[PDB]
Ligand binder design. Structure first.
Ligand SMILES: [Zn+2]
Lengths: 256, 256
């Protein structure tokens, strides 16, 4: 099944998490999807000291665990520091390595020592071919015999790569669709349709393009009321918009 | 005085640190320079699990302290996690925020709570205008009354910005010299002549350009025998090469 990772950018409140979890129930039950509910417990890189951070590790994981129990959802969250991985893996089925930390050896190893699927975001600064080395760090942590990263070995060992765009001058990200093909030599590839759009509405067009190229899954942030969101309101889809997008992805994938 | 930050990329051994420290003694006594000896205790983002990492925090700081004591040098090192800052500041006169972590709030705040000068490396993915927000996080930590970052206030409070190039397609960094002017509105500006050169030596040429534009200091890594170095051998200058470069920088700066 194609992977769908969806949810709000940040944990805002348990009430908010519940509302979005509720509106994702139709997609979560879609037989053609392997679904994971996403929410960050920490936004580590915001513009100001006053910017909303999220609830942090302990309280965030507690809230994600509540969603897992109440909705039966598998969970994705991102980690930022040493010693978060093992604690987060008790709740999270996928642990995500942030794009800025995508080469960070200790974090990749620490996450790979857990039982979680590892989703490695490609840095905006990276050549897709060089992501093989991050995949290999993870794979060697799980099986020291592995010498070279391949899709099949990565799929078996739960290590994925995630496309989220590349720096294109200042304040602009471009999605090099060739990267989806290049990276898929080394690991299953997820396309992040939310964070990849920056320009100095394009989420569906890029996700359709990505589906046509060949991807193993979609990452897209969604919120019931984006204009009242505490992070990424301008770029999140409403649940009905996401359903439409997923419908199109599936139709495209059904051709090939 | 113009700042000079120089030393090996990584701490290789005490013997190596002493050898390069010895060769830097003439530069360190140049009264036109405010000199800091640099060496990383950890290389966090290397290609493979087997790549040389460095001695780690505890042993690294011991070695840097020995250099400070034996040579009288002020010290710069980079920190990678918040919990390292308070102990690192006991030895390092400057704590450097790595380029990939240049927006990381907790790290900037923790480092800024120490008495160290803060050297914030501009990420390869950043618009130089946006570096004001990282400077402001640091400044507000040191003086809550500050509303917007300026060169004067950053200088007073020991917060600097460091140019190290920008992503230019794949496997290429370009130095946008306009950035030196733009960032200097917000803080003193150091130019990193070592890590800014990547192409699919240009260090002296880019350093001369930077000197002509207007900078508060130079960061350049140097090693006695680069071909036998454990990190960044290809990009480090021999001490005599660094001396020539600094001589040229000072001649240019004396014109204006
Ligand atoms: Zn987001």
């Amino acid at each position: 099944k194609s992977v769908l990772i969806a949810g709000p950018c940040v944990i805002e409140s348990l009430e908010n998490l519940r509302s979005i979890a509720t509106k994702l129930q139709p997609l979560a039950n879609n037989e053609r999807l392997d679904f994971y509910f996403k929410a960050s417990f920490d936004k580590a890189n915001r513009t100001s000291l006053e910017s909303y951070r999220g609830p942090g590790l302990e309280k965030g994981l507690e809230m994600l665990q509540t969603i897992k129990e109440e909705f039966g959802y598998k969970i994705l969250t991102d980690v930022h520091e040493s010693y978060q991985a093992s604690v987060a893996a008790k709740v999270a089925d996928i642990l995500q390595i942030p794009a800025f930390l995508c080469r960070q050896t200790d974090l990749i190893v620490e996450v790979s020592q857990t039982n979680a699927i590892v989703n490695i975001k490609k840095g905006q600064f990276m050549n897709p071919k060089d992501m093989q080395y991050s995949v290999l760090k993870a794979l060697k942590t799980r099986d020291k015999s592995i010498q070279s990263p391949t899709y099949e070995t990565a799929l078996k060992n739960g290590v994925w790569l995630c496309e989220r765009g590349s720096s294109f001058g200042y304040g602009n990200l471009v999605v090099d669709m060739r990267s989806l093909k290049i990276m898929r030599e080394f690991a299953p590839v997820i396309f992040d349709a939310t964070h990849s759009v920056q320009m100095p509405s394009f989420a569906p067009i890029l996700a359709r393009a990505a589906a046509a190229v060949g991807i193993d899954g979609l990452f897209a942030e969604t919120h019931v009321d984006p204009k009242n969101a505490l992070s990424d309101g301008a770029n999140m889809l409403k649940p009905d918009e996401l359903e439409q997008l997923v419908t199109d992805m599936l139709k495209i994938q059904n051709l090939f």
